[PDB]
Amino acid sequence: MVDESDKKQQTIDEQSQISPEKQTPNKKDKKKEEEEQLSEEDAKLKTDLELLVERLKEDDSSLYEASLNALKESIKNSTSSMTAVPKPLKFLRPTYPDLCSIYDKWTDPNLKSSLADVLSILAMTYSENGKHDSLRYRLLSDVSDFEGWGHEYIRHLALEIGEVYNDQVEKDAEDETSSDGSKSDGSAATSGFEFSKEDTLRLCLDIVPYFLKHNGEEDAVDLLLEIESIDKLPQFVDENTFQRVCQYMVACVPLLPPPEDVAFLKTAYSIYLSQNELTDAIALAVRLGEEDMIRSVFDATSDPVMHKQLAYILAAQKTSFEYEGVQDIIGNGKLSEHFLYLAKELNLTGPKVPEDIYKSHLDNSKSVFSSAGLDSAQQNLASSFVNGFLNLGYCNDKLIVDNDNWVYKTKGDGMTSAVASIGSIYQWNLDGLQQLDKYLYVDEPEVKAGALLGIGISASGVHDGEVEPALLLLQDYVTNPDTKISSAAILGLGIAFAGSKNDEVLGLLLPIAASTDLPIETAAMASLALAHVFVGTCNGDITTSIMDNFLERTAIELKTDWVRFLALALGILYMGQGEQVDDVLETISAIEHPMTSAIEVLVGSCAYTGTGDVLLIQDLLHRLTPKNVKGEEDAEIKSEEKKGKSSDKDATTDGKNDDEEEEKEAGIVDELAYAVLGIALIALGEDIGKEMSLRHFGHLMHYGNEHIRRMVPLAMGIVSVSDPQMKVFDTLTRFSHDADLEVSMNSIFAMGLCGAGTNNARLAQLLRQLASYYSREQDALFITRLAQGLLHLGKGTMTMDVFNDAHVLNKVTLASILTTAVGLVSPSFMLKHHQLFYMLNAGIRPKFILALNDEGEPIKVNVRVGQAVETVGQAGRPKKITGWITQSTPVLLNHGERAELETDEY
Template sequence: MILYSRSNSHTSLHAMYGLAMEIDDEIAADENDKEMLQEIVNNTKLSEGYLTLARDIEVMEAKSPEDIYKVHLIDGRGASSSLDSARQNLAATFVNAFVNAGFGQDKLMTAPSDSSSSGSSGNWLFKNKEHGKASAAASLGMILLWDTDSGLAQLDKYLHSTDTHVVAGALLGIGVVTCGVKNDCDPALAILMEYVNKDDSNIRIGAILGLGIAYAGSQKDELRVQLSAILGDPQATLEVLVFTAVALGLVFVGSCNEEIAQSIIFFLMERSEAELAEPIIRLLPVALGLLYLGKQESVEATAEVSKTFDEKIRKYCDVTLMSLAYAGTGNVLKVQKLLGICSQHLEKGETHQGPAVLGIALIAMSEELGAEMAVRSLERLLQYGEQNIRRAVPLALGILCISNPKVNVMDTLSRLSHDADADVSMAAIISLGLIGAGTNNARIAGMLRNLSSYYYKEAAHLFCVRIAQGLVHLGKGLLTLSPYHSDRFLLSP
């Protein structure tokens, strides 16, 4: 990430964490200084500084997915993958976006129309199917990350497409490209608001999530009014309503906003038994928990209300709220409570033990000793836990050591990547990408190359390997997924 000068460290921290701050005369009396500091807080020059750094260390050259896969280093099996072309192209889209994030150029989406490579952005876009097209269009937002002027101009052409998936992807891309960048004109708001009430569900979801990403943490009241109105729309599909709740959680993360919390609670209470059985409904407790992220006791009133929910979602919601409210606090009592939940034997097919495992990682991740103890506890869960717990353990390890490739965790995940249970092995592969995210770690890169050869006949596993490879080379090593600052002194929401 970009580090600003030490003299302006307090403003750069506000910028990194997306906190709104107006520079007044007490902070800077000189108008030029005030303007410069406001640009830092608004992240206006973030793309420019990022590209300057990339040029200085000579990593500007665009990389293709094949450059990351390094198939020539693998035996013949890895080169002749059985992965179906649509899924292979989707994997390449994600890898391309991760690797070239923020560089403004790549070999798939921004390649010139006369290019002899994979073709222009239009050609690559239509090598995908349905949601693959949406991902390809949205990936342009990642490639042009923080460059709002160029990014919005390039994404605009996709908004005129007759394919709803392309339009939805472009709207999501607008959210990604403007994420963390504050602009007085609010171009993202002006564009996305036009699409939140469209008839097509894909377009609505793209616009709603775009707003959630673009204004994450901003607590913008205009969005509260608009998005809360969608929650009460009887014509909206369940997917639209759930993603609206998630967007509200992102925009008002850590705000403890009671009005939004009540809207989500009422929405949950009104769901039928059939709707509560849908997997997507589990995002609603996550949306509710985001409102109380890291706020500890502030969640207690909402947690009490959650005890009145239908039994299909009650325990899941309770564990999720606790995990998010105490995330990053290192609260030992809450970790012990979650370990106690993991020790229970479930008879009814309940699903709350998975979030309990992830909650252990979220709570313990804030300091070194707690994280080390959590790793040991998770290894015990691997040995003695039931299958639904084992499936969550690799992801918990990935969260605990995100962008921090510890050798013991790396070895554990490498072992689990060959587990007999497909869910465990795929989670371990993704977690190898998480712990190595943005580090260019050579050992993890080698492990993933070997896994691509090992799973060359398994489409789902190979897809996970590709995603992990993209994460390891995130931003060619200039980006990180770690939320910490100053040796774990500060934790970004």
């Protein structure tokens, strides 16, 4: 206790009858008082260590608290663990826990903070020797259940994660940085960090993302690979190990800068690759956009068998899924050589099989015609369009169309949009060519423009097997001098091949089809083409595009509306990237206008896309500044300025939309509540600001892909009957599809009630109807959405034209663009390898707001839904495979993936 005679060899035993108490008092005193006794203290280190083990299996708190009170002082606050230095350093095996007994078991906030730091210093230094590693391992695996071990291992490994901070904040590091008081360079870091990874996998699951994100390196995710692949078969089974990982990786997407954010994913693909669930590995490869990643996954699955089996099929269906098309081109190769079949295997690799399931789906759901028939007034315009929009996605619309009477009768620039929407019926399906050639071959150029857009959309179905490809038709039609006819011809092509970039694709769109001497709005469609094709795979933010962006702008700037269209197409090109977008800020800006600076901030939001650490605060300084300066003070040349001022509003809304997509499962839920509030604030500060914010708001919902989709839109939609602008409904309904005729049935019924009671303009009526007919696609037919489906945080490839027109005035002319909406997702079927179009049962889970799961993986419990359903909108998308009951296990794990399910039946 407090006696110096209690240090005798005899007096260990005499003391220990009472209780072991030889360790502190006398011993401590002599070690901290005479150097000579450190030579003795060394041999007795072993003896002491054991006394802590015994009184832990007979754990009793009192006799550590009180006893090792005065012990705290010698260790590091007085001796400072460095006389001749070597001697205290070696004795850090049995004294590190003695510090911890006043850190941990004695409780007080005040002592948690203080001693945390001290421990960090000691761990690190004794992990140079590497004997602190050894102390960690023997608690994780313990020797007996007690309250000791189970707190001690948590704290030790927690502190290492702590250390890396001190060197980043300041150059100084060391004790002056009070965060851990540790230098944090190799020695107790390198050697300790390697052990650290192994420990945190076994019991731990909730400090692991904290370890990975703080380092903020792809080196950390690279060491992690190896460590995890060792344990993945004995300690735990692959199934458990794989989910635990999948929890870590998703969590760290918030709180990482752009260059780090993508780098975290790249490495994550490798972890997946080795791990036996190859399904996950392949989806993330596309998102990244690097062909090489896709190649490896497909080949590994295909080659080991010379028979058909589950293996060939499995490889082939994963490559079919993307409607970007990049996977499709690649996958042809090994399977082709083999000739088990060309007919079957080749087809399932490419997008030929998805067409066929779409046909099947069209018969199942039918296509209940219920289109508006209204003639006359501006109500005429609306009717015509509604026929297209109602029956959006692959259908048979032939009989109504066959009467060209109403198509020609559709007045104005409205006429063009009526033909365009005939084009929309024919998505991802060769069939419907027949109707298009009629309009194309006759009358105004106008009818021909909608028809040509239509060919691009019809050739989309099959473009890898190249059946009546897009390219052939439209090539002839580029040449035709008229700007309208050129431009439309090149946008359908852009859509068809999509994220696919080939020698055929590049050279066609290369000489722009926009007349620089005319500023025709449907001749804007040339820049749209370039934006679309580049996105849907990695974006080099290319220079060829900038040369032309400047070219259209310089020539004509008198029409402000048009030049805003080019600005928006440029920003969109870059999206799907946040790391090369910084580089192109310099490049774009080199040229001088107040107009070029307007473009700068738009593209700025795209750069900082990843987390709200940067994003949310830029779009808030920006927002406040008009409002705040104006509030404070109170309490050709023209046309350039006007663009300037308009873009700031836009830019604030855009940065908010882009950020929330990325965030936490947790963070989505709070940003939504806030968004509604933000409407009141902007309304307070500035009248003008309110108007722009509203229209964007409905797109906020679509872009972020909120979790919910059932209750919230409709709640919001009531409020926005009162708020000005009726484009709020147009953008809002593209989010609000969900299962079709659930939400949307309520959207059409409600909307026409309020418009007939309160009518304030026929223009106003035009929007209300359009939106509501759009919303439903009959009986839950495959839906448009920003996400790919396969990519959970997926950004649009052909669903980005929406935002462009929301910012600018409301006219019938803009609607042409809106016809593009390719976004259709497969109706899943439980396949074996005989390509069965019929499900046992599958579980859907509507709940998608959970913050308990970070993975956002549907709980296995679920609720059972039938066969030949569509993979419904968000808050329904999470689908798990019911199969457990009939002794069956998914090979292809769906977490809410688009993906066709596949099982191995035991």
